[PDB]
Design a protein that fits this description.
The chain is of the alpha+beta class. Helix content is 29%, strand content 22%. It binds 4-chloro-6-(2-methoxyphenyl)pyrimidin-2-amine. The PDB classes it as chaperone/chaperone inhibitor.
Length: 215
């Protein structure tokens, strides 16, 4: 029996599209900061469910453990960052991952063209897009309480897709899957991941575990 699935294809907001093009087509040193930005987003999402659970403890029915998992896969060249934070509703997803303008986008692009280090991206509220420093495609799977699980994906180029995810269920949280560019495979190495977590993400207030495939 053939299954049918609805897909929605969206255009990035004009300046977000401009920023993504600048990140992808310009050389930057210090690309390693992409992981800091993603872990920071996870930490923020974990704070959110933690505080929400104080007013409504049943919001943890979907999983009580608050943590971050890092999963490098050298076979398909993906680095996956998974958290059990609050997750995103459909509205959160579309508004936070490309359709709604961000007030910091223009300032940051001016800063970059002026020679600013790419590390400054977090300050401007668009840190997620640093993923495209190392990834040619990014897939985001997310599950918020009382909503369905959604899959967001983009290879840049001006568009992204959103669909209801019929794949493996997450209890609650967000999974960011980085399909790495061929020259950025160092971020699949255990030593390198430990290095940049130690350097940039040492004060995160939730457990982080690195899972390393044998061999
Ligand atoms: C505001 O949070 C985000 C902004 C941009 C991209 C992703 C996120 C996000 C949201 C949630 Cl609930 N979790 C995670 N890990 N990232």
């Amino acid at each position: 029996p053939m299954e049918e699935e609805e897909v929605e294809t969206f255009a990035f907001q004009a300046e977000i599209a401009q920023l993504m093009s600048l990140i992808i087509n310009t050389f930057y040193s210090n690309k390693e900061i992409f992981l800091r930005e993603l872990i920071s987003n996870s930490s923020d999402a974990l704070d959110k469910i933690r505080y929400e659970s104080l007013t409504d403890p049943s919001k943890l029915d979907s999983g009580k453990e608050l943590h971050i998992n890092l999963i490098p896969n050298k076979q398909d060249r993906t680095l996956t960052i998974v958290d059990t934070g609050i997750g995103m509703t459909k509205a959160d997803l579309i508004n936070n991952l490309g359709t709604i303008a961000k007030s910091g986008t223009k300032a940051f692009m001016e800063a970059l063209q002026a020679g600013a280090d790419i590390s400054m991206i977090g300050q401007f509220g668009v840190g997620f897009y640093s993923a495209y420093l190392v990834a040619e495609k990014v897939t985001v799977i997310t599950k918020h309480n009382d909503d369905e699980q959604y899959a967001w994906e983009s290879s840049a180029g001006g568009s992204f897709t959103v669909r209801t995810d019929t794949g493996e269920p997450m209890g609650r949280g967000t999974k960011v899957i980085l399909h790495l560019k061929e020259d950025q495979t160092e971020y699949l190495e255990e030593r390198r991941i430990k290095e940049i977590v130690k350097k940039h993400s040492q004060f995160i207030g939730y457990p982080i575990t690195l899972f390393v495939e044998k061999e």
